[model samples]
Target: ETFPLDVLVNTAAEDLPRGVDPSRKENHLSDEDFKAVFGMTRSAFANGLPLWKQQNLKKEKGLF
Candidate 1:
């Protein structure tokens, strides 16, 4: 009984974040944000950046 109750409580806490709607419009990440993280602007990726460069950037400093 005690272990089951603990599991139920943990599951409820984890679900809270996913259940709630975003309260602020400005807090969301946009398409530009997605491109910036991958180091490719929309214009650049229209043709695609080389695979090696993308992999290299991920391992570089100040990226993560």
Candidate 2:
């Protein structure tokens, strides 16, 4: 077996973010709030279509 010559600082996974929980099984995001996230996603995709086309045009011409 071998080890690095320099100092070694490793963070074990179970060490950092201490034992955690909301302790709130009663609390939750409403169904409507979950549905609201869909609008942001839809508009982002809708707005990116033109940029998508332009990127391929430039890539083909080697302007990228």
Candidate 3:
């Protein structure tokens, strides 16, 4: 199935925080958002493909 590569990368980089700091609103993410970030991380590891390559493969498969 197709997925939003940008969303996955952004979520992993921006939304997935290393540690929690309630004082910082930017560190907060909804439960679903957390799941999405982790899920994409897992997929990337499993697929063993970089974002650019993954996006290219997805496009070739008509997923874009």
Candidate 4:
């Protein structure tokens, strides 16, 4: 299947900033917190598009 790279990257760009807020105190995290924050970011970046597609597929298949 053809992956929607544009959709994925665009969604990631829009969604990432919302997840990692720089305004909060712990938002300026370090060590494990830092690692965990970015780890989730990476997971979202990698999975966001495919998961969206999967959801769409499921909806198309009337599995929703």
Candidate closest to the true structure, highest lDDT:
3
lDDT of 3 at 4: 38
Among all candidates shown, the one with the greatest TM-score: 1
For model 3, what is the alpha-carbon lDDT of residue 7? Answer: 32
Q: Rate the local accuracy (lDDT) of all candidates.
A: 0.35, 0.29, 0.39, 0.36
The Cα error of candidate 1 at residue 11, in Å, is 23
For candidate 3, report its TM-score: 0.28
lDDT tens digits, residue span 1-64, model 4: 1112222232233543444432222233444643443344534433564756545543443222
Error of 2 at 26 (Å): 55
Report the Cα lDDT for candidate 1: 0.35
Clashing pairs in 1: none
How do all models score by TM-score? 0.29, 0.24, 0.28, 0.23
Q: List residue ranges in candidate 4 displaced over 4 A.
A: 1-49
Please tell me which model should have the higher lDDT, number 2 or number 3: 3
RMSDs, each prediction? Answer: 13.8, 18.5, 11.0, 14.2
lDDT of 3 by residue, 1-64 (tens): 1223333333333453345332221124354553444445534523576667655644443322
Candidate 2 backbone clash number: 0
Ranking by lDDT: 3, 4, 1, 2
